[PDB]
Amino acid sequence: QLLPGTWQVTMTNEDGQTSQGQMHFQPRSPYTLDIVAQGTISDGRPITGYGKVTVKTDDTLHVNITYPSLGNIKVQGQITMDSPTQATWNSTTSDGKKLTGTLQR
Ligand SMILES: CC1=N/C(=C\c2cc(F)c(O)c(F)c2)C(=O)N1C
């Protein structure tokens, strides 16, 4: 219920790069929210991505997102709602790299 809206996002990946940008969550049904993402990686690559947060019966928040601006790499992971104003992003890219970030509202 707290996800919908815009979040400021900072991330770091296993290649030692960092990223900054935003994620925007749109409620769709009781079991899914749509996500769109914008930002920039520390190597200069622009970030444009879109996906879905799927909610399982145990309330786990699974995220799948594809990034056309990064050669269509895909990211799959889980969001952990630490508080009403903070969430943690743990994921792995389709290249096999860890991607960790923090969402702040
Ligand atoms: C800041 C930010 N980085 C994102 C994705 C992202 C960042 C990275 F550093 C990656 O290597 C990568 F494969 C994806 C994203 O969606 N946002 C909002």
Ligand 1 site: residues with CB under 6 angstroms? 9, 11, 13, 17, 19-23, 37, 39, 41, 47, 49, 67, 70, 73, 75, 93, 99
DSSP class of 58: T
Q: For residue 20, give the ligand 1 atom closest to its CA.
A: 1
Give buried/exposed letters for 74-97 (b at 16+ CB in 10 A, else e).
Answer: bbebebeeeeeeebebebebeeee
Q: Tell me, what DSSP letter sits at residue 16?
A: S
Q: Where are the domains of the chain?
A: 1-105
| Technique used by the depositors | X-ray
9 neighbors 39 (Cβ within 8 angstroms): yes
The pair of structure tokens assigned to 7 is 């979040």
Q: Among 72, 75, 34, 68, which residue's Cα sits nearest to residue 53? A: 34
Residue 42, both tokens:
């520390």
Resolution (A): 1.8
Q: How far apart are the first and last CA of the chain?
A: 14
Instruction: Write out the H or E segment, with its range, that includes residue 92.
Output: strand 86-93
Cβ(22)–Cβ(10) below 8 Å: no
What's the 24 CA to ligand 1 centre distance in angstroms? 13
Residue 47: count other Cβ atoms within 10 Å of its Cβ: 18
